[PDB]
Design a protein around this ligand. Structure first.
Ligand SMILES: [Cu+2]
Ligand SMILES: [Cu+2]
Lengths: 620, 620
């Protein structure tokens, strides 16, 4: 079997059995994170050493542990006691979410805060949010969660329509104490409901839509072997799954006539921060590190046929571990299907009298995740022409607050008295590059304008310049849409028939990067978000832009410290980190339920093939 | 019947009969352009005065004429003799293309130029290209075409693979004389063939693609009445067709519960220039004004089911006039169909236990045109959420030249000895705005970053600024992807339930604009291409960014002269002109046939609706 195959229920069980036997999984221990480790760089061995990394939390306050287990040999490879005050807290546990609402329900100052607003505690829902790193010395070394209240008029009510502004509570989830309850003042609680399923708000559902039936009478053009290996129209890859990153793509390759050519060794969204631009003390601490703190994969939804994924769909049901080490299957968590993508090429030649047309197609691999009010769709597309594309679809319910009577420069009004703080959804794609092998380099291409004059001019000429990024310290790049700036990852030791280095060009959307002040806490913890492109020399432990433990951890430990090593990236084993995001100034059309908005990036062949790779597509 | 209905064969015939009777269509006269005029602004009349604008060329050298005809009353409204030396030549005629190859075949210096390259004249194809305005005083007032030779080894051979560099011929197409033959030197003629249908180049066609069947068992959700009026999922519009602009969209409106709301009065691609960045005297004069000089609509292809348009397609067969005034039908020239567009909205709420998912859909209206080696697909999309989008799909065969042995800073190598000059495809969208009526205004929105400090700061706040464009002179805008710059067209006299002006936000791709030196001839003739956005006060005669007669006309007569009137655009009948384009540095993958590359723009509701307009979509 393949070493990139998905973790199985039996493997999770083995990790549990091994940790138990070793005395690392007692009744007071909890598994905060568990996932398969990628095979080592020197994988020229038949050694199918299937290893797992596990983060073990202690419910009675003892130091947590980082453990690496070999399911193959049945032993514990290494176990280290963490100092969470130094390196950060472990990712939030699902069971800890419940605790903050339960502890506050019997806290006197919380009750006094609610009584002062004439709110019945049984109707107050508390959103358990991550506690960043701010001015509270007593939080260091302790597992703290912040709570924001939302009123729920009835069981099926959308609480997000009823935010309780001016109130925030800090809660120590291990010692089970409420450290603080801050009340800056009472704000009216928006009364209007935001129930998108209630026929009074929706009105009569339209009857005008006729069905669209998309079928494949002969089945799909792609084959799946080994549970997760995919073969489609010359494309070859392995679809992986990690509780923290979500869908991970391994060994992306293209079959260039007999020769299977590597393009990307590993591709994943390694982090995604959601900073808020509201300066109010009630939410100025709000920054979701959906990947780092919550673990996106853990919240993957089970997708339904016809609703979530349309067409001839083949599903992948990834297995995950719960807090006790028991296997938990995310049924239908990954959708896979191919779809028509219009015209690929076309020409009607007058001189030869030949009329030519070919259709394009794309392979889709996606999963959706839900984190509180937020729902994100992750989509990877592979096109016939060699193009690779990623698309994030952001939907769900927008995070609310109260709209101040005087107005606001950092909040939008969605309904009477109801506001939505300005924010960004910034993603970090970690592209472990293998353009025809591991000897890669990155070039920055800028369009260059020429002056009219003596040197060949009528004033029509324009050119292009390419500078090679040689060392990590000069590999922190910013976009420039004015000069058409793109980046080419090429292999200097692999040339095409014109004797030029084969490459792939990265096209960014050029949306703004982190807007927070460069001196802020979020700018330090999410430094990667301040630049469009970073290139590092590969290393086994440099997995995340922010570091291993994001939860309540200070900044720097990620990309800025990697880059400080100033390694050579000119024809080396490199990793491209692309930052891309959406700046969300909520509009009326986003309430009560948000229609999809998208961001992404694509990579296109740049002299990779000797000619058009789509000359062999038939006319169906 | 509707006054925006497509011109009919019977109407073309009437225009011919009327011009003949009036003595304006003698045997020596030719129709260079003919199209329906849009109803006047004060269309509050039952006067179905169907008028046509006609450009009449004289084949014996007499002055051409501009004529307006009323098919309704059966009379000639106005006829003016043009001074083509002042205002420009008429658009190129199809019959004139043939002439340049025929005249050169018997010209001695052309024959001597071919003999010196050992080329058989019967195998030399001459591409009839538009003559811009350069340093030749003898061309002014005369109808000139430039010719570039391409060798065709056999009838079905792709001549574009065999360019004859170093040779250019100027030809006066009316007097039928060859004014010049320039030979700067012999260049090897690339021998390799670029035949994408030859099984030796394509190899064995892949058998791996399984069919994808897209059907609508109950037919489409849209209805067509009056030949061209469209009703679909609350959207309402008229699909027009003009020989010069191609598909034109009229009266785009959205049905907001009982109230039909206007969004765009008229939308079209009013021009598209293709400037070349090769400084060589053989092509430095090359700039296709596909819309202005050739007339895009005239070259619209007949689209085939399953190849060009997939799904349940309804076609529109626009009628055009030939050079003698006879009707010519472009069979299946416009495709129309709706298609699934993934997830529209989705949320799985923990607190209420409700799981919600809705699918998105888009209405597609497209046509393809072929101009020499170039093929462009024009697509207009309408989404359920109120979003409007345009997409240009550029394909065909890339314009070739010889690749100099020493190399080039303005040409890419596609094959041994074969080159492709750098160029741009710049489009101009003319959006005659009607956001809830004709009282519109344009605002420029920039993201604004805030400094950490006293005024509400922890360094997380960020805002947005909006400046109103009040007069035409300050309405020439440039993009700025760094600050997330967008433009909102709102109606100050129409507010939503939050008492804010309803609007639509324009999202540009932010690709580079015209790269040519600001002092060049192309920068003058295509001044509109130098800026991303222009807003003008509507006027009946300000139809094109470049003016009425582009062919061999100097610059300025377009947008720069309109804007000089400095009219008020703050809450007025305004027109938005958006410039968007692709900077094409050809790559190996573009040869021998170019896979589709795309550009476009979209407009999204910005507080136009009182809440999400998609709450009534059912779960199919
Ligand atoms: Cu958002
Ligand atoms: Cu091009």
């Amino acid at each position: 079997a393949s070493p990139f195959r998905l973790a199985s229920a039996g493997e999770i069980s083995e990790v549990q059995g091994i940790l138990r036997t070793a005395g690392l999984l007692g009744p007071e221990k909890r598994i905060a994170y568990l996932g398969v480790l990628d095979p080592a760089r020197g994988a020229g061995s038949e050694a199918e050493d299937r290893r797992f990394r596990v983060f073990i939390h202690d419910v009675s306050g003892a130091r947590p542990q980082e453990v690496t287990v070999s399911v193959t040999n049945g032993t514990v490879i290494s176990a280290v006691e963490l100092d969470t005050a130094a390196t950060g807290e472990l990712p939030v546990l699902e069971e800890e979410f419940e605790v903050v609402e339960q502890l506050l329900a019997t806290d006197e100052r919380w009750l006094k805060a609610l009584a002062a607003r004439n709110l019945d505690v049984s109707k107050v829902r508390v959103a358990p949010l991550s506690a960043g790193v701010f001015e509270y010395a007593e939080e260091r070394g302790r597992r703290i969660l912040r709570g924001l209240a939302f009123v729920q008029d009835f069981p099926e009510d959308s609480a997000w329509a009823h935010p309780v502004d001016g109130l925030v509570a800090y809660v120590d989830v291990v010692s089970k104490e409420v450290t603080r309850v801050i009340d800056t003042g009472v704000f009216p609680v928006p009364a209007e409901h935001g129930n998108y399923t209630d026929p009074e708000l929706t009105g009569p559902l339209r009857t005008t839509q006729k069905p669209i039936s998309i079928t494949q009478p002969e089945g799909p053009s792609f084959t799946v072997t080994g549970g997760n290996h995919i073969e489609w129209e010359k494309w070859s890859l392995d679809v992986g799954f990690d509780v923290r990153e979500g869908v991970v793509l391994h060994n992306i390759a293209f079959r260039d006539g007999d020769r299977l050519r590597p393009i990307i060794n590993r591709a994943s969204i390694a982090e995604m921060v959601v900073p808020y631009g509201d300066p109010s003390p009630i939410r100025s601490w709000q920054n979701y590190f959906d990947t780092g703190e919550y673990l996106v994969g853990q919240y993957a939804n089970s997708l339904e046929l016809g609703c979530d994924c349309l067409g001839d769909i083949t599903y992948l049901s990834p297995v995950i571990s719960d807090a006790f080490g028991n296997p938990r299957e995310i049924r239908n968590g990954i959708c896979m299907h191919e779809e028509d993508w219009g015209i690929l090429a076309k020409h009607s030649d007058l001189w030869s009298g030949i009329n030519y047309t070919r259709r394009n197609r794309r392979m889709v691999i996606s999963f959706f995740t839900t984190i509180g009010n937020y729902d994100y769709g992750f989509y990877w597309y592979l096109y016939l022409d060699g193009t690779i594309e990623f698309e994030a679809k952001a939907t769900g319910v927008v995070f609310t607050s109260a709209f101040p009577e005087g107005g606001s420069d950092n909040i939008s009004q969605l309904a009477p008295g109801l506001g939505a703080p300005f924010h960004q959804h910034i993603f970090s794609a970690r592209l472990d590059m293998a353009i025809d092998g591991f000897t890669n380099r990155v070039e920055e291409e800028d369009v260059v304008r020429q002056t009219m004059g003596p040197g060949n001019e009528r004033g029509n000429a324009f050119s292009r310049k390419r500078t090679v990024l040689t060392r990590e310290s000069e590999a922190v790049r910013e976009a420039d849409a004015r000069t058409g700036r793109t980046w080419i990852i090429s292999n200097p030791e692999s040339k095409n028939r014109l004797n030029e280095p084969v490459g792939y060009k990265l096209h960014a959307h050029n949306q703004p990067t982190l807007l927070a002040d460069p001196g802020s806490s979020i700018a330090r913890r999410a430094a990667f978000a301040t630049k469009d492109l970073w290139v590092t020399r590969y290393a086994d432990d440099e997995r995340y832009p922010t570091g291993d433990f994001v939860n309540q951890h200070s900044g720097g430990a990620g990309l800025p410290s990697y880059i400080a090593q100033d390694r050579d990236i000119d024809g080396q084993d490199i990793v491209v980190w692309h930052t891309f995001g959406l700046t969300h100034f909520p509009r009326v059309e986003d309430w009560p339920i948000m229609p999809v908005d998208t961001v992404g990036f694509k990579l296109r062949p740049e002299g990779f093939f000797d000619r058009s790779p789509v000359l062999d597509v038939p006319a169906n």
